[PDB]
């Protein structure tokens, strides 16, 4: 009963505490009753007689330990609990619990969060530590963390908890670790200015069946699509719910007019009679899209006559000229060509654009460097909806929230990400540990890869 | 002031060349080989070659029609 009288609070040094690590004993590699030595930060077997924590305490004379699963402090050489208010910051670093008011206030939050080391930072925009050259996953997660509805849904543990899961399900481990990592990202009282996603990368490898490996630098588009589909699949009961959080945040309704094309080396009369044969006629198919794939136009492939070697630039509206009845797209399938023309039906509240780079040609894979010119302030999408579905919609104005850029060749590239801070309106570009303030003027001056837009 | 000369080249270029020359009469009295040297700043070569500097280049060299040609 000698608590509140521990003479060892001075030995605690918050600088050497890295709670991003997996909670396993440093000797027995056991997950049960993880205890961290606040003097050194290494985990141990647990509080008990002749245990690893006890051995460490009697060897290195470390007297204060923290129970990872309990969020309570103890002394092993004397073996008594600790009840102090000064240790609550460590508890919040380990287990950041966000209340509803603070969760809502993150949109209006405009104070520069200060870390223990003194490197004042901003909530949400926190440097992600690359491990084995897999910056694509870090960039995708940073882009996803900027979505307000997703932030509200994942910030509080019980919001995505209390659901039925399959007994053999491991996807819920990934979905519940994303919440932990993201509430670490939004925590305004971090000991260190950065966040280590290594546990998230390990869970991604465990659930992805060896794809999106830490070693390999996979495509951002495929990783984002797989992550969204997996998050939708995990959540809900034992049977999938029609409208999960990912569905109501990103999914939209779009319409495809697929028309079969006869062989171009056919007689005109034969082509006409085949068209009249009801097989090569237009068919309407509705579908749900998590994102819109933007096909960059063909490169000039030749120097400009006047100002030689000019990088191509395309307005965003020419790319947006897709998804309407006026424009078609002759898909040159190896079997036969298809005349597929798209048309948007129901815009999602949040929009994801994926600019198709890294297109495999007939012999290898090359990256299209064409730059897209877009108004960062706002865009209009009411003009790309059919007249039947424009009555329901009232908000088609979209503003850019997140931007992904790939720098370098496909063999070895770097994934940089610009994010818009809602509180201040400033754009911040972060690449690995590097974080910098970037003016919105030159946001469009980069090889945009994935864009996240908000309908407001 | 100069309708034909404003037709030939850009109006801004025409104004600049008459201003540097001293007047319509002053410019009309100048030889053709001298007008193209009007407003030719002595750009200093910063270790680069003289060709990079593009010397003996005047406001006419930077006009609209001239800049719409290949460098050679």
Curated annotation (Swiss-Prot), chain A:
Keywords: Cell cycle, Cell division, Hydrolase, Isopeptide bond, Metal-binding, mRNA processing, mRNA splicing, Nucleus, Phosphoprotein, Spliceosome, Ubl conjugation, Ubl conjugation pathway, Zinc, Zinc-finger. The keyword Zinc applies. GO terms for molecular function: hydrolase activity; zinc ion binding. GO terms for biological process: cell division; mRNA processing; mRNA splicing, via spliceosome; protein deubiquitination; RNA splicing; spliceosomal complex assembly. This is Ubiquitin carboxyl-terminal hydrolase 39. GO terms for cellular component: nucleoplasm; nucleus; spliceosomal complex; U4/U6 x U5 tri-snRNP complex. Its EC number is 3.4.19.12. The U4/U6-U5 tri-snRNP complex is a building block of the precatalytic spliceosome (spliceosome B complex). Component of the U4/U6-U5 tri-snRNP complex composed of the U4, U6 and U5 snRNAs and at least PRPF3, PRPF4, PRPF6, PRPF8, PRPF31, SNRNP200, TXNL4A, SNRNP40, SNRPB, SNRPD1, SNRPD2, SNRPD3, SNRPE, SNRPF, SNRPG, DDX23, CD2BP2, PPIH, SNU13, EFTUD2, SART1 and USP39, plus LSM2, LSM3, LSM4, LSM5, LSM6, LSM7 and LSM8. The keyword Zinc applies. Deubiquitinating enzyme that plays a role in many cellular processes including cellular antiviral response, epithelial morphogenesis, DNA repair or B-cell development. Plays a role in pre-mRNA splicing as a component of the U4/U6-U5 tri-snRNP, one of the building blocks of the precatalytic spliceosome. Specifically regulates immunoglobulin gene rearrangement in a spliceosome-dependent manner, which involves modulating chromatin interactions at the Igh locus and therefore plays an essential role in B-cell development. It is found in: Nucleus. It catalyses: Thiol-dependent hydrolysis of ester, thioester, amide, peptide and isopeptide bonds formed by the C-terminal Gly of ubiquitin (a 76-residue protein attached to proteins as an intracellular targeting signal). Zn(2+) binds at residues 37, 40, 56, 62. Belongs to the peptidase C19 family.
UniProtKB/Swiss-Prot annotation, chain B:
Ubiquitously expressed. Residues 1-72 form the Nop domain. The record marks 33 as: Interaction with U4 snRNA. The record marks 56 as: Interaction with U4 snRNA and U4atac snRNA. It is found in: Nucleus; Nucleus speckle; Nucleus, Cajal body. Phosphorylated by PRP4K during spliceosome assembly. It comes from the Eukaryota. It is linked to Retinitis pigmentosa 11: A retinal dystrophy belonging to the group of pigmentary retinopathies. Retinitis pigmentosa is characterized by retinal pigment deposits visible on fundus examination and primary loss of rod photoreceptor cells followed by secondary loss of cone photoreceptors. Patients typically have night vision blindness and loss of midperipheral visual field. As their condition progresses, they lose their far peripheral visual field and eventually central vision as well. Involved in pre-mRNA splicing as component of the spliceosome. Required for the assembly of the U4/U5/U6 tri-snRNP complex, one of the building blocks of the spliceosome. Identified in the spliceosome B complex. Component of the U4/U6-U5 tri-snRNP complex composed of the U4, U6 and U5 snRNAs and at least PRPF3, PRPF4, PRPF6, PRPF8, PRPF31, SNRNP200, TXNL4A, SNRNP40, DDX23, CD2BP2, PPIH, SNU13, EFTUD2, SART1 and USP39. Interacts with a complex formed by SNU13 and U4 snRNA, but not with SNU13 or U4 snRNA alone. The complex formed by SNU13 and PRPF31 also binds U4atac snRNA, a characteristic component of specific, less abundant spliceosomal complexes. Interacts with PRPF6/U5 snRNP-associated 102 kDa protein. Belongs to the PRP31 family. Interacts with the snRNP via the Nop domain. The coiled coil domain is formed by two non-contiguous helices. This is U4/U6 small nuclear ribonucleoprotein Prp31. It comes from Homo sapiens. The gene is PRPF31.
């Amino acid at each position: 009963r000698r608590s509140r009288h521990c003479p060892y609070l001075d030995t605690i040094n918050r600088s050497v505490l890295d709670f991003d690590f997996e909670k396993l004993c440093s000797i027995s590699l056991s997950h049960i009753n993880a205890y961290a030595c606040l003097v050194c930060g290494k985990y141990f077997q647990g509080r008990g007689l002749k245990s690893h924590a006890y051995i460490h305490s009697v060897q290195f004379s470390h007297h204060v330990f923290l129970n990872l699963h309990t969020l309570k402090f103890y002394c092993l050489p004397d073996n008594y609990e600790i009840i102090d208010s000064s240790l609550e910051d460590i508890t919040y670093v380990l287990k950041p619990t966000f209340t509803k008011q603070q969760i809502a206030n993150l949109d209006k939050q405009a104070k520069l969060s200060r870390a223990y080391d003194g490197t004042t930072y901003l909530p949400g925009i926190v440097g992600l530590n690359n491990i084995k050259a897999n910056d694509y996953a870090n960039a995708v997660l940073q882009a996803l963390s900027n979505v307000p509805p997703l932030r509200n849904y994942f910030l509080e543990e019980d919001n995505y908890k209390n659901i039925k899961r399959p007994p053999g399900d491991i996807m819920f481990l990934l979905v519940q670790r994303f919440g932990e990592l993201m509430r670490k990202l939004w925590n305004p009282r971090n000991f260190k200015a950065h966040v280590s996603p290594h546990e998230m990368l390990q869970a991604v490898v465990l659930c992805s069946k060896k794809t999106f490996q830490i070693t390999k630098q996979g495509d951002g588009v495929d990783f984002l699509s797989w992550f969204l589909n997996a998050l939708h699949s995990a959540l809900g009961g034992t049977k999938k719910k029609k409208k999960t959080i990912v569905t109501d945040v990103f999914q939209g309704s779009m319409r495809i007019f697929t028309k079969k094309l006869p062989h171009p080396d056919l007689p005109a009369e034969e082509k006409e009679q085949l068209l009249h044969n009801d097989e090569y006629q237009e068919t309407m198919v509705e579908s749900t899209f998590m994102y819109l794939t933007l096909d960059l136009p063909t490169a000039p492939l030749y120097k400009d006559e006047k100002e030689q070697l000019i990088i191509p630039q395309v307005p965003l509206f020419n790319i947006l000229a897709k998804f309407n009845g006026i424009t078609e797209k002759e898909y040159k399938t190896y079997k036969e060509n298809f005349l597929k023309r798209f048309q948007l039906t129901k815009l999602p509240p949040y929009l994801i654009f994926c600019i198709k780079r890294f297109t495999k040609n007939n012999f290898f894979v090359e990256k299209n460097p064409t730059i897209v010119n877009f108004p960062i302030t706002n865009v209009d999408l009411r003009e790309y909806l059919s007249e039947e579905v424009q009555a329901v919609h009232k908000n088609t104005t979209y503003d850019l929230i997140a931007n992904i850029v790939h720098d370098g060749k496909p063999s070895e590239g770097s994934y940089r990400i610009h994010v818009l801070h809602h509180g201040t309106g400033k754009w911040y570009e972060l690449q690995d540990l590097q974080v910098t303030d970037i003016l919105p003027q030159m946001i469009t001056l980069s090889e945009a890869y994935i864009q996240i837009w908000k309908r407001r | 002031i100069a309708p034909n000369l404003s037709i030939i080249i850009g109006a801004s270029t025409a104004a600049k060349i008459m201003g540097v020359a001293g007047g319509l009469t002053n410019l009309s009295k100048m030889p053709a080989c001298n007008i193209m040297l009007l407003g030719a700043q002595r750009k200093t070569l910063s270790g680069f070659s003289s060709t990079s500097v593009l010397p003996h280049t005047g406001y006419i060299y930077h006009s609209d029609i001239v800049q719409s040609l290949p460098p050679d």
